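Model the whole thing, not chain by chain.
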Amino acid sequence: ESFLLSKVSFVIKKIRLEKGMTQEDLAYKSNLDRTYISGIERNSRNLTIKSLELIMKGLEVSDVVFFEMLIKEILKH
Amino acid sequence: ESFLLSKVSFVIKKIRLEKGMTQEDLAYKSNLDRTYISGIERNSRNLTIKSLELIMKGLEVSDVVFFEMLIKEILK
Amino acid sequence: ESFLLSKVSFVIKKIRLEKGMTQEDLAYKSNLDRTYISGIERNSRNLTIKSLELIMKGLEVSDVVFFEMLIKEILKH
Amino acid sequence: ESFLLSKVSFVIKKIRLEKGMTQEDLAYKSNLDRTYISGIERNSRNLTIKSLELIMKGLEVSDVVFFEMLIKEILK
DNA sequence: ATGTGACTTATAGTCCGTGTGATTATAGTCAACAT
DNA sequence: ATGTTGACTATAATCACACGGACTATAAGTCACAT
């Protein structure tokens, strides 16, 4: 569907595994539904900047380093 | 409101201006509503990635250039 | 399958709803997985007395009270 | 160990005796292993409902009578 | 008769994830009128 | 030109649940040898 979305959803998962988190921890720490974290990674889903922020806080990661990894993923072949 | 959401909006407005675009024209170029655009720039909207993407295409700016800018703006 | 199991299964759910609990709450307080609580209610799984005991403690109900409702459900038409 | 588990077992042993059965015979009647039964009666086993059901069949006691008894036993 | 121990094998119970209908909050989109 | 106020309607986001596969702990079932 959307170019950027699958990149965002890819990076959320990448970080989540890097930090040895599971989906449902992240769902807690991000103060969003269990199934939403799944749905974001699983398919992609069209999240909101506010929701993205919540997830970033949950990944225990800064806006900045998130976007830095986002850029790197976009740039790949 | 949100810090990120504010910086996003600021960035959208910044790029629109360094390109000498009007809102009217930013909305024409991305096929969204001008009041919608207005709203974002006065930070009254919490856009989705999809929408953000349409706005980048309307600004004629790559995802990467946008985020490069968004990062810099984020750091005061 | 087993006669007693689906009865035990039924009564666990009945109580759980009577107390306005959700599976999530229950598996919570029973310190079992929410998958297992679901599994039990769903497909009448074959639990252990120890696990049943945990569920009773989770339902905030006593041995006695449970077995009294168990007897009732068995007796029904 | 568990409180319930001990009284299940106690009950199983109680009924086997009130009937005049040996373990050997409770095992035969319920098509289970004798050491299996001995284990339960010394309370070294944590039955599943299914197993309990087989032991009730062997004792020839309905679920209801078993639980009526277990309750009474439970209340000291 | 019953009670051990110790040793496989079935399965109970765990852990992480997928996929889904139904409801609620809210973004997406477009009016009217402002300046 | 841009701002703001309601609106309607799509959909983001929530909530309670089912379902699967893979792995770990342990109950199920059977030996040998006590007594």
